Symmetry: C3
Subunit: 368 residues, 3 copies
């Protein structure tokens, strides 16, 4: 039983779901195993919506860091005196600060919109609520919290009028994800500023993870990553971003993280994973699509692509985190040790260990 493994059939809680989309919310990282207690302030949210759809405007008491896996979106954040629309593409990411009102459109005509966002609540540690402004068959708008009298006074209106317009106590929609006119979307999209190479380091607009050269890349996979060093949005959240692709039958050589807690999310494919932790203990698990395997800090682990494989990883506590490899040539730790220490470390000869390490000649991704 692998505590660092969250399947998908039956921890994701569906927050809303209709014929137009669904929003699921991963279970608390510490409700699973107290071993994950330093993640108690984090959640995973998965949003899927149909082509030509919107998410009705709303805010939450939590930062968000969202990542576009596939499809195309329009993320519009509304403020007290401004509005900002951003044209997200696959591999784009952006930060929705806490308390900001916003809506999500899927401007595509056939493709789906699969987004995953990392919630960081503000009031209750690892719990947060969703304030929908709109009054839908599926949710009351938070304006209906206020008394008639307050409402009449606040809006300068008889109740029958504010009710008949904003609330409606059928005239209202079915769900918080509704469908859009082509004509509508045609308007909504023509003022969305979009991700560019110039945004790698902007505290506002979205930056693309895969825009840059992958840190690691060879015939067996590619390792894209963005870190608080290069991105102010990720400096404040102090988290690192990385999305990495593995050719079926390759794998990511064993490695550990100096100081980062990593939340990987399986985007596509199948994969086997092996985590070790303390006389050592094997933490293996067989991950499929939409699964989540968390990898504590400084724990060595390996990723075996049992199919063509792409996943997203969130790196908690990522200021100056370093990746260390035990196999392969470049970034190998077990090959920087002084020889005499190598001798002393294992049962073998300085030259005998110098021989076994030099064997496997590739680095980062190697083939099964």
């Amino acid at each position: 039983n692998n505590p660092f493994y969250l399947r998908s059939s039956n921890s994701f809680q569906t927050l809303f779901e209709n014929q137009n989309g669904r929003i699921r919310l991963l279970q608390r990282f510490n409700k699973r195993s107290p071993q994950l207690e330093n993640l108690r302030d984090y959640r995973i949210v998965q949003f899927q919506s149909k082509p030509n759809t919107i998410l009705l405007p709303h805010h939450a008491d939590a930062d968000f860091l969202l990542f576009v896996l596939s499809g195309r979106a329009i993320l519009t954040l509304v403020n007290n005196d401004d509005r900002d629309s951003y044209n997200l593409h696959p591999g784009d990411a952006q930060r929705i600060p806490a308390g900001t009102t916003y809506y999500l459109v899927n401007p595509h005509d056939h493709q789906n919109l699969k987004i995953i966002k990392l919630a960081i609540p503000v009031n209750k540690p690892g719990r947060y609520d969703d304030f929908f402004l709109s009054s839908t068959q599926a949710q009351q708008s938070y304006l209906q919290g206020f008394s008639h009298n307050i409402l009449e006074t606040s809006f300068h209106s008889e109740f029958e009028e504010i009710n008949r317009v904003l609330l409606g106590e059928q005239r209202q929609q079915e769900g918080v994800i509704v469908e859009l006119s082509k004509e509508q979307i045609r308007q909504l999209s023509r003022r969305a500023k979009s991700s560019s190479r110039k945004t790698i380091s902007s505290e506002d607009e979205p930056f693309n993870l895969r825009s840059r050269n992958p840190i690691y890349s060879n015939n067996f996979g590619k390792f894209f990553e963005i870190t608080p060093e290069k991105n102010p949005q990720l400096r404040d959240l102090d988290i690192f971003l990385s999305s990495v692709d593995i050719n079926e039958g390759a794998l990511l050589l064993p490695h550990f993280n100096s100081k980062a807690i990593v939340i990987l999310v399986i985007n596509e494919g199948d994969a086997n994973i092996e985590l070790v932790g303390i006389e050592v203990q094997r933490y293996r698990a067989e991950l499929s699509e939409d699964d989540v395997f968390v990898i504590p800090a400084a724990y060595p682990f390996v990723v075996n692509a049992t199919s063509n494989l792409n996943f997203l990883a969130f790196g908690i506590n990522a200021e100056n985190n370093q990746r260390n490899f035990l196999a392969g040539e470049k970034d190998n730790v077990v090959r920087q040790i002084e020889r005499q220490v190598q001798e002393l470390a294992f049962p073998g000869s300085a030259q005998d260990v110098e021989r076994l390490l030099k064997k496997q000649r590739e680095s980062y991704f190697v083939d099964a």
Copy 2:
């Protein structure tokens, strides 16, 4: 039963009280409702003093942010090698860094001194202690912690000597708040550097919340605020101050704070308040003088002044916090959504909705 409402009668605990005033300590915010587990690191104190009294020198294991609600005071801070007296007036605010020995004088003849301070204990979370230097009838000087021999050694004297002067085991005051000589207050009161417009941004001297123009003001009320943006002393604790007048039968329009948890204390007047959380849930509560009400971030709330009303707000987690309103002209989100989305959100012609919003022609403070 509003877990965000702290009835002054049964939420305060007197700490030292007598003929010359009293000190009371608000209860832990988390012990009330676990919904407030992010304020567990904070406490509220009310210090009230009769005219021409002093608070005997002492210190705490908590950073203090004191706000003077009413009266005049001479705050003095004794360091290891320096002393710094300050002249506080109503509205003045200053920060007593933890473990700083300090005494409070009330130089007024007829007027009291009503202060309120936010406490951030350093040793236990939410719990702090007071180390009174004085040997009193209500408290032992903490020097009376040391054995006779260490004390003899430390001061270079006999014990009968050092007890007869500093401890006294009838010669010693009844409380930690004792009356003063005019001649004393004459002398104490002539070196206390006083607040001014050149102090809004000092690490050291206190700053006035109201020496600057409010951020909102109309005939029905005023909204004074200082943030970590303009203050170093606030930047550090990462808190905003705000002090707002609402005429009777006016109200603060329905709004929510993006990421700031607000601890508001009713200074003067009566008010009704309304909070919404999640199908929505009304959280009304009828505030009176000295009451406390807490408003989690991104929670919409409204404050209805049922008699001339002024209150004080401490905004916890206020780096880059935005106020959003839901009613009135200026700073209304609901009125910044793309219209076509307004069509989709409420059961009301985007035209029929543009009409309702525009109706209330005022902003921030409107009239019941």
Copy 3:
């Protein structure tokens, strides 16, 4: 039963020990009393090794701040692409980023290597694990966590050849501290950069606490101290390091810390200690070598040196903390209070109190 006092003969727990030394791990600070809750994220590690010994390579999911109390060590950090050896002398401090893999060497022929290190665990709060690369009769190597297929696929070899070289399932050493050839230590000592007066403020190499002038130093004692202000490394951990010495029969004049929580580890000699908390409460404790006494912030406390003494102190919550002294000429707070308040503070004439406080002519360390 002083909760702030952790007796060494029964508050340590041994993690590894053999004929080549032993590693102890202090018990959890709050496990003892909830009163120390604010340290819960910290631990004390003690290490000591025979002459001519190496601590086999490992890493831990925790930052370490080690201090060389006594001996000469060669500290070698091994990165993915770099390697960094440091020649540590007594008084040298240096910081091991979590998940850094590193090995310790004791190059002396007769002397030891007594090192203590403060531990800040990443994943679980207050709990960490040592991941040892090395296949030893004591512990498995974490590469034995993985499974044969993955191990085979990783190194590009069969299993027998990888188990005969790195693991060995007789041929392997006995414990995680093994002895060295002189030839070995000789080669291995070739590039260990050593501390210097030009390291007092380097973010990398180790800095000596005593290489500067102390803050306090008369004929009865010395107070070496370094704050986050002067060291980038102590800044990131927000800590102060202070090595102080007290002659037999002198003491540290009673005093309290403004906002730092102090973890003092008794290094050499005996000492009587006394603490005061809250009606006051005496917390006296008779420390011996290797004991640990923790001092809540703004708790006044005196240290009596019953034999020739020296202790290391950790200053948690260090940024801008202030030592306030209750007796003595210099840094005495009680001698700063206005005279008229002094008159009002204690039962004694302003001149009768001015008199007692001028007696002790000396400052900080007096004689008993």
